Amino acid sequence: YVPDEWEVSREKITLLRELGQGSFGMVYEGNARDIIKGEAETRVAVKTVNESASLRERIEFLNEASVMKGFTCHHVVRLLGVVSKGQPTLVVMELMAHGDLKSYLRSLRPEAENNPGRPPPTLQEMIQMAAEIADGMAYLNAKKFVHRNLAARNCMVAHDFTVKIGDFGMTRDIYETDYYRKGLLPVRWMAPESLKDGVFTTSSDMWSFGVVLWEITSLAEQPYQGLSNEQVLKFVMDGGYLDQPDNCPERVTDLMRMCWQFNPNMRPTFLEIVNLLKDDLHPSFPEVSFFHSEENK
Ligand SMILES: COc1cc(N2CCN(C(C)C)CC2)ccc1Nc1nc(Nc2cccc(F)c2C(N)=O)c2cc[nH]c2n1
């Protein structure tokens, strides 16, 4: 790692509270002073790497930040700055003020003690979420990333309820092996060919996308609840897939069934999902999407 214009002074960052454990260590909510032009102060998420990490891991932490330097998508959580001089090393992100998509959906259940007094997501809101997630994933696919970790908990929710992909889903290649499958990669979100032969492609991400939609419409229940990890592996490898949540919108169901095609070739691409959903989204969508951008080539 070598510093550049992404270097941000430590003293600019004030930390406010722990948000939770990220893949590398504790993530914090904070404030950053003069980190974006036209803004005195910016609400940030600050990633850290925890004490127990090897030097190799510490370098891997910064390399992840390095990769996000080349991402400018409204529907992927963006990097704001890096504090690399001295320890602790800090990776500064746009804050996603409504948390991960899984916890956000759980807050919307009838029986949630942390319920914001708002109704569960409308069909309209759900479709918007889908196109947003799909647009972020399309960007990553164009950048040549296979995510491998698409799940509601890995997607974030902004202040204005925009949903973004938290990261490019960076995993060491070893976690793709049969030992770890049957590990950091979640078997309840995995395509049958990934489960079978460790094939991870943009098509297997589409399968995981379908599970996200299932999480959206079940308000983040656990996929295949009542089955063990061994039972899911077989069930899914034999041609099985999730039942539709009670009174799930038919439009979302049709989207999930497209994703859960056994033959990867028969599944949609992320651009195709955005295309399928594009004609009834928020008027701001074309202005911010990768789909409608000059970069979508
Ligand atoms: C207030 O903002 C948040 C609240 C919660 N709440 C979660 C629900 N909690 C309940 C269970 C107590 C309260 C905190 C969770 C996340 C955010 N915002 C946020 N988090 C990020 N990363 C993570 C935070 C915690 C755990 C994680 F695994 C991650 C991660 N996957 O990286 C980022 C990264 C960029 N921007 C981010 N913004």
Three-state secondary structure readout of the chain: CCCCCCECCHHHEEEEEEEEECCCCEEEEEEEECCCCCCCEEEEEEECCCCCCCHHHHHHHHHHHHHHCCCCCCCECCEEEEECCCCCCEEEEECCCCCEHHHHHHCCCCCCCCCCCCCCCCHHHHHHHHHHHHHHHHHHHHCCCCCCCCCHHHEEECCCCCEEECCCCCCCHHHHCHHHHCCCCCHHHCCHHHHHHCCCCHHHHHHHHHHHHHHHHCCCCCCCCCCCHHHHHHHHHCCCCCCCCCCCCHHHHHHHHHHCCCCHHHCCCHHHHHHHHHHHCCCCHHHHCCCCCCCCC
Q: In whole angstroms, how far apart are CA 297 and each of 137, 139, 143, 286?
A: 15, 11, 12, 15
Q: Which residue among 96, 114, 147 is best mutated to probe the pocket of ligand 1, counting the most ligand atoms within 8 A of its Cβ?
A: 96
Rounded Cα–Cα distance for residues 199 and 59 (Å)? 27
The maximal CA–CA distance of the chain, rounded, in angstroms, is 56
Q: Which atom of ligand 1 is nearest to the CA of 93?
A: 35
Q: How many residues does the chain have?
A: 297
* 175 vs 77: CA distance, rounded Å: 24
By C-alpha distance, which of 161, 176, 269 is closest to 216? 161
Whether the CB-CB separation of 128 and 160 falls below 8 Å is answered with no
Q: Which two tokens stand for residue 168?
A: 């490019």
Q: Which residue's alpha carbon is at the smallest distance from atom 6 of ligand 1? A: 99
Asked if residues 91 and 79 have their Cβ atoms less than 8 Å apart, the reply is yes
What is the Å distance from ligand 1's center to 91 Cα? 14
Measured in Å, residue 17 CA sits from the centre of ligand 1 at: 11
What Cα–Cα distance (Å) separates residue 82 from each residue in 68, 101, 108, 140? 11, 25, 34, 21
In sign, the C-alpha dihedral spanning 276, 281, 287, 290 is negative
CA of 120 to the centre of ligand 1 (A): 20
Please, what is the Cα angle at 24 between 61 and 26, to 5 degrees?
Answer: 120
197 neighbors 139 (Cβ within 8 angstroms)? no
Question: What domains lie within the chain, and their CATH numbers?
Answer: 1-95 (3.30.200.20), 96-297 (1.10.510.10)
Q: What is the whole-number distance in angstroms between the Cα of residue 93 and the centre of ligand 1?
A: 11
> Quick check: bond before 88 cis, omega within 30?
yes
Closest ligand 1 atom to residue 103 Cα is 8
**For residue 43, how far is its CA from the centre of ligand 1 (angstroms)?**
13
Query: What residue owns the CA closest to ligand 1's atom 19?
Result: 96
Instruction: Report the residue among 13, 19, 91, 104 best suited for mutation to probe ligand 1: largest number of ligand atoms under 8 A from its CB.
Output: 19
Say which residues have a Cβ less than 8 Å from residue 263's Cβ, sequence separation at least 6.
none
- CB–CB of 253/241 below 8 Å? no
Q: What is the resolution of this structure in A?
A: 2.2
Residue whose CA lies nearest to ligand 1 atom number 26: 20
Question: Rounded CA gap, 110 and 4, in Å?
Answer: 48
Between CA 263 and CA 23 the distance in angstroms is 31
Q: What is the phi/psi pair of residue 281, to 5°?
A: -125, 170
Nearest CA to ligand 1 atom 29: 22
Instruction: Output the CA 28–ligand 1 centroid distance in Å.
Output: 8
Burial of 266 (0-12, 13-18, 19+ CB in 10 A): exposed
Distance 19 CA to ligand 1 centre (A): 5
Ligand 1 binding residues, C-beta < 6 A: 19-22, 27, 29, 45, 77, 93-97, 99-100, 103, 156, 166
